[PDB]
Structure 1
Amino acid sequence: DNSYKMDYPEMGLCIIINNKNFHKSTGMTSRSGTDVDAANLRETFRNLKYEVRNKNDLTREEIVELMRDVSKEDHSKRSSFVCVLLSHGEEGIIFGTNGPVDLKKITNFFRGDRCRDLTGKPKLFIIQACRGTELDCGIET
């Protein structure tokens, strides 16, 4: 078998973290249009038979806590795991509403030795966020 076993009773969780409004003291602008993203994802992964949970405007502490809790759920009947992050970012960093979170800290909860119910199962992180401030000028074809 060259393909992951996807016929567990459940496809798995799809966590969508949708950060639109940030605390004023961060200086971060509101991410207009991200609700269109969150709704589109919700419906798309519903049709793929994922159990979608949309969360909105989470602090960096709420994000970390959410990932810890989700990593501690019973995933034994689930084929895979999906987490979508919609926020401001920089390289290796996603922003809570009140400050930054290391992407590594988020994904470490799901490491093969720390989330045993997901050992051997695909863990997908979909990240809509800046990775810096470079602009791609493109080249004509």
Structure 2
Amino acid sequence: FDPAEKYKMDHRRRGIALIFNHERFFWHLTLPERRGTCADRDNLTRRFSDLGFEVKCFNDLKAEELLLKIHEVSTVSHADADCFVCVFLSHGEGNHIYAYDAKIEIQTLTGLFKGDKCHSLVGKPKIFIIQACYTLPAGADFLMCYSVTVNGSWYIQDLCEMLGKYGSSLEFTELLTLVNRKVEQRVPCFASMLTKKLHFFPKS
């Protein structure tokens, strides 16, 4: 029973990094524009591509479209993939994220990737990064990263900076730990249901 066991990260593909980016909102929600979220979006796009991810961004989806998209991604095959990354950059009321027109419960989004529902991701890391102005990991191998101006937000800037230097070498949670320190110096948080060490060594 090896205390230095790492997740298997030598599949054909790294996997998908889903980015839902929300800048403006339906007028009757009365939510302020999120200035520099697009900078965050692009920054995350660079960093994650560099780590081998197929990055798919969507901007300002309405609830229906977002659920369609995420449900779709939950149902393609991840059998030849290492892991899955999903990012939300929007407003958040409670355990909800905002789409363009309405709230969605985070649990209903994350639950799409639990084992009973997404077989090809079983025993692989499922990483959610949630940057929102609450929800425990959906199950085994889930990692939730919470953040708790025109050039981006502190959390995404510092996460991306760390991904840039250390992403290819460090264990991912120790890298988040650095992000905690970085941000604090200028507090964010991760919650882990991971079962092994996670690294993003460059692929063959």
TM-score (norm 2): 0.63
Count of residues in Structure 1 that have an aligned counterpart in Structure 2: 133
SS in 2 for 1:124: strand
Which residue is 2:144 aligned to? none
Structure-2 separation of matches of 1:91 and 1:99: 13
Tell me, yes or no, if structure 1 residue 112 matches structure 2 residue 108. Answer: no
Aligned to 2:14: 11
- In the alignment, does 2:39 pair up with 1:36? yes
Q: Between Structure 1 and Structure 2, which shows a larger proportion of strand residues?
A: 1
| 8 Å contact from structure 1 (residues 91, 130) kept in 2 | no
Distance 1:122 1:112 in 2: 11
Greater relative CO, 1 or 2 (CA 8 Å, sep 6+): 1
**Percent identity over paired residues:** 40
1:57 partnered with 2:60: yes
Distance 1:123 1:91 in 2: 22
**Which residue is equivalent to 1:124?**
127
Q: How does 1:18-97 map to 2 (within 5 A)?
A: 18-97=21-100
Superposition map of 1:95-106 within 5 A: 95-106=98-109
Report the CA distance between 1:21 and its aligned residue: 1.1
Q: Which runs of 4+ in 1 moved over 6 A?
A: none
How big is each residue's C-alpha offset from its partner over 1:19-45, in whole Å with a ceiling of 9 and x where there is no partner?
A: 101011111111011000000000000
1:130, distance to aligned residue in structure 2 (A): 2.4
Show structure 1 runs of 5+ residues with no match. Answer: none
1:105 alignment partner, SS class: helix
RMSD: 1.5
Q: Is the contact made by 1:42 and 1:52 (CA closer than 8 Å) also made in structure 2?
A: yes
Q: Which has the higher helix share?
A: 2
C-alpha distance in 1 between matches for 2:108 and 2:68: 11
- TM-score normalised by structure 1 residue count: 0.90
